[PDB]
Every structure is written in C-alpha cells, then in structure tokens.
Chains A and B, each alone.
With several copies, the nearest count.
Chain A
Amino acid sequence: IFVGALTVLFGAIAYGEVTAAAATGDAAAVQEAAVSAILGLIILLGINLGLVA
C-alpha cells in the first residue's frame, strides 16, 4: 500500500508536468516532461525495491 500509494503520488506529479507542458503547445516540451516521468517512475521502482530488500 505504501509503495503503491507513493507510486500513485509520483505518477500524479509526473502527470501534472506533462499536462502543464501540453498546455504550451510545444511537442518538445511535452516530450521532455514525458521522458522525465518515465525515467522517474523506473527509478522509483529501484528505490522501492531497494527499500523492500
């Protein structure tokens, strides 16, 4: 529930950035926020896994 809740919180924050970037209309700005979100979520998994271990 902890990792799950946090992953959700992170996704929400990431989503916020993507949405904000999309508002500008710049495809490149959205891409940057998206790559960041994807890499961030992957790192978050690393953190969560490391913690459990």
Chain B
Amino acid sequence: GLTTLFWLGAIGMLVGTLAFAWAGRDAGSGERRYYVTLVGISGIAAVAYVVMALGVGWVPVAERTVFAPRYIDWILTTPLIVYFLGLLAGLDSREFGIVITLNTVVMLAGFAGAMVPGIERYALFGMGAVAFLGLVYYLVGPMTESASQRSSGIKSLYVRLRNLTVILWAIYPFIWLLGPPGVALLTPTVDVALIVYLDLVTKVGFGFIALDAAATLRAE
C-alpha cells in the first residue's frame, strides 16, 4: 500500500502545483515571485512522490526502510518555504542567508542520520534538532519583527503561515524518532501516511492560505 500512498502524495502535490500556477497567471510584478515559489515547493515534492511511487530510491538500511527522495525533497523544498516566509517578512540577503543555513543543517542532518546505522544517527538527529530550534527562534523573533514593518495584511499572512510552519514542522522530528529512522515503532506504511498528510498541509495547505489572502493584499 506504500506505492498507493506515494501516488496519493504525488496527486495531491500535482493538484496544488497546478492551482498555484493558474492562480498566479495574472499576478502583478510584485506578487509573481510568491506564486512561482509555491509552484516550485509543491512541484519538486510531486516529483519526489512520483519517484517513490515508482519504487525508486527505497533504501533498506539495517533492517529498516528509509526513502531517499523524501529527504532530498525536504532539502530542496523547505528552504523555498523559508524563502517565501522571508519574502513576506522583508528580509535582506544576510538575514535570508542565516535562516537558509539553519534550515539546511536540519534537513541534511535528518538525511544523514536516516542513512546511518547505529547510535551515531542520534548525534546527527541532535544536530538537526538544535538547528531547528535556532530556525524557530528566527521565525518567531527577528523575522516576525521584520514582518511587523510591512502592511497589516502582510504581517497577518506572515503570522498565519509562520504558525502553521512552526507547529507542524515540530512534528516531523517526532515521526523521525518514532519511525523507521529512529526506534522504528511506526511501520513504514504508517510513517509514510503521516508524512503524506503533513507534507500536503505544509506545502499545499500553506499555499492555499497564501492564495486566499492575495485579493486582500492587493486591496491594501
């Protein structure tokens, strides 16, 4: 039922990708980047799910099953989500560089740990967990302050997307620890189903919330 779950993830990401592309067809010169980023976020995820649905990238590591495309997906898409949040917050190059750096450590850490048999994987997890707390600090602190300098509508959207992000992203590390990568209490099937749900919400749900605010922002 794994392939079936991966196909559902692919379909969900595809629907989102198309909706975002269509919704941004007539976007102004200032909204453009936002729509394009959303397309890239869900588009790359759709590819990762298709690759896994086709049975590619499955890695039977020390009596467990980890999926390489899942982590590759994250390494490339989460920084785009952070970029989107950063654009709303109005960050400069330096500030973007800081959060992208932190985000990348998180994703590379989970990927490396997932491929590492033995207790060493937990040290790698720790590296990612600490970087993640640092990322959360920037999102709720400095970046929120930066967002406060924008319009009420922008600040409002930033906050909604940031909350969704902080709260749901915080769940992934528990699934990593409880799933195949860690103590393997969750079966590959349950692990994949929970991630499909979380991925769809953090990418497609995230996008629809932005699309829903578009008209209000233009009116401002």
Contact = CB atoms under 8 A, between A and B. Distances in A.
B190 A37 contact: yes
Contacts, number: 54
Which of A13, A35, A43, A51 has the largest count of B CB atoms less than 10 A from its CB? A43
Nearest to B169: A50
A43 to B, nearest CB: 6
Interface stretch (B66-74, B147-155, B194-202): B194-202
A44 B186 contact: no
Interface in B149-208: 163-164, 167-168, 170-171, 174-175, 178, 185-187, 189-190, 193-194, 197-198, 201, 205
A40 B186 contact: yes
A5 B189 CA distance: 19
Interface string A22-51: 000000000011011101100110110011
Interface residues of B, number: 21
Interface centre among B1, B174, B187, B205 (most CB of A within 10 A): B187
Contacts of B205: 51
Contacts of B198: 47
A40 B190 contact: yes
B168 A40 contact: no
Interface of B: 1, 163-164, 167-168, 170-171, 174-175, 178, 185-187, 189-190, 193-194, 197-198, 201, 205
24 contacts: A13-B1, A13-B190, A13-B193, A14-B190, A17-B190, A32-B187, A35-B185, A36-B185, A36-B187, A39-B185, A39-B186, A39-B190, A40-B190, A43-B171, A43-B194, A44-B194, A46-B174, A47-B168, A47-B171, A47-B198, A50-B168, A51-B164, A51-B168, A53-B163
